[PDB]
Amino acid sequence: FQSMGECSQKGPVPFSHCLPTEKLQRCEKIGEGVFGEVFQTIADHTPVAIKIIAIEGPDLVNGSHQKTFEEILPEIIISKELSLLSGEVCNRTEGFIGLNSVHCVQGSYPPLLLKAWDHYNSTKGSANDRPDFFKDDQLFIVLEFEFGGIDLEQMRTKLSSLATAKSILHQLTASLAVAEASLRFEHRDLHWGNVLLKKTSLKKLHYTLNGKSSTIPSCGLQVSIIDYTLSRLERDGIVVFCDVSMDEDLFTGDGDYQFDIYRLMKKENNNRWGEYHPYSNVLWLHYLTDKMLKQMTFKTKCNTPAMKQIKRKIQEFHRTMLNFSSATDLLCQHSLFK
């Protein structure tokens, strides 16, 4: 059965099942990675994001081998578990992205998606191969997500002030804490492409951690965490994760603190990726705080002592947070969030 038993179709479906004519025609490419492609479209007046990953074939795609179904299952499972936290009671958060559906699709790549791919290449430039070489027996996983807004990297020059950065860090820490508490979750790849920002009219956002509800001032933005390709969690003691113990390349990057975080995770976990080490979530939050202070540039600087104090408190968070054991420890004990 398709979509984890929430679609009545059995066996692979064509692209047109997921992308009927008007939905396909409205696709625009919004992102990419070695994994594949991300398109935005609209259905029932509501934007969605469609992540398309080739699986099970022998061709290199963007320079790498395609995952098998067994290899892609963890991202599918984790996407669903994290989405479901929006509807839970004891441990509840909307800070992970909604998952609408997941399909296994068979076919060559739609010409209309190639048109969108071309437009992105012509305007932004792509690091990927044009995905025009797939045959009619090719399998894909198509994940349809809630549209989460714009990634923090693309918002480098677009945020109002460091007050907004504080909200963003609080939202991220709370979401991670709730997922720790519910699922013994580690994201493991929370670079600034994976933090999405969308406008909200809500003044406060709500979460529940181990039965205790609280709120976070939004500063007009709702944060969504995406991309569970490297993530880990467990349910009733059964662990789902990406075993990267034998990966060379993941640990040899340079030129950004991001690449150090991979090495620092490996140090923390002794290269045993099945274990639960929620300190990895602290390391990613440190990397994001570091981006907030060193790479983000804000429309309004910290011009008054009250704004300079927010800046100082974020600097203080940066210099103290590595002494906390988990996002839960940070949320519950760090002075930034009191």
Ligand X SMILES: Nc1ncnc2c1c(Cl)cn2[C@@H]1O[C@H](CO)[C@@H](O)[C@H]1O
If DSSP states are collapsed to H, E and C, what string results for the chain? Answer: CCHHHCCCCCCCECHHHHCCHHHHHCCEEEEEECCEEEEEEEECCEEEEEEEEEECCCCCECCECCECHHHHHHHHHHHHHHHHHHHCCCCECCCECCEEEEEEEECCCCHHHHHHHHHHHHHCCCCCCCCCCCCCCCEEEEEEEECCCEECCCCCCCCCCHHHHHHHHHHHHHHHHHHHHHHCCECCCCCHHHEEEEECCCCEEEEEECCEEEEEECCCEEEEECCCCCCEEEECCEEECCCCCCCCHHHCCCCCHHHHHHHHHHHHHCCCCCCCCCHHHHHHHHHHHHHHHHCCCCCCCCCCHHHHHHHHHHHHHHHHHHHCCCHHHHHHHCHHHC
If one asks whether residue 52 binds ligand X (CB under 6 A), the answer comes out as no
β-strands 212-217, 221-225 pairing: unpaired
Applying CB under 6 A, among 96, 147, 273, 279 the residue interacting with ligand X is 147
253 is in an annotated binding site: no
For the chain, the C-alpha Rg in angstroms (whole number) is 20
CB of 7 to Na ion, least distance (A): 23
Applying CB under 5 A, among 5, 7, 50, 307 the residue interacting with Co ion is 7
User: Which region, judged by CB under 5 A, interacts with Co ion, from 1-9, 64-72, 179-187, 252-260?
Assistant: 1-9
If one asks whether residue 224 binds Na ion (CB under 5 A), the answer comes out as yes
189 is catalytic: yes
Residues in 97-136 at the binding interface with ligand X, rule: CB under 6 A: 97
Q: Which of 132, 189, 249, 290 is catalytic?
A: 189
If one asks whether residue 191 binds ligand X (CB under 6 A), the answer comes out as no
Residue 31 or 98 with smaller CB distance to Co ion: 98
How many residues in the shown chain lie near Co ion by CB under 5 A? Answer: 2
Q: Token pair for residue 141?
A: 């996983």
When CB distances are held under 5 to 8 angstroms depending on the partner's kind, the choice from ligand X, Co ion, Na ion, none that residue 2 binds is Co ion
CB of 173 to Na ion, least distance (A): 15
CA distance 179 to 328: 9
32 is in an annotated binding site: yes
When CB distances are held under 5 to 8 angstroms depending on the partner's kind, the choice from ligand X, Na ion, Co ion, none that residue 12 binds is none
Residues in contact with ligand X, shown as a per-residue x/- string from 148 to 177 under the rule CB under 6 A? x--x--------------------------
17 is in an annotated binding site: no
If one counts every other C-beta atom within 10 angstroms of the C-beta of residue 6, the result is 11
Residues in 20-49 at the binding interface with ligand X, rule: CB under 6 A: 30-31, 33, 38, 49
User: Which region, judged by CB under 6 A, interacts with ligand X, from 140-148, 179-187, 238-246, 309-317?
Assistant: 140-148
C-beta nearest to ligand X: residue: 31
CB of 54 to Co ion, least distance (A): 19
If one asks whether residue 288 binds ligand X (CB under 6 A), the answer comes out as no
Which residues does the annotation place in the binding site for ATP?
30-38, 51, 146-151, 189-194, 227-229
> What residues make contact with ligand X under the rule CB under 6 A?
30-31, 33, 38, 49, 51, 97, 145-148, 151, 193, 196, 226-227
> What residues make contact with Na ion under the rule CB under 5 A?
94, 224
Positions marked active-site? 189
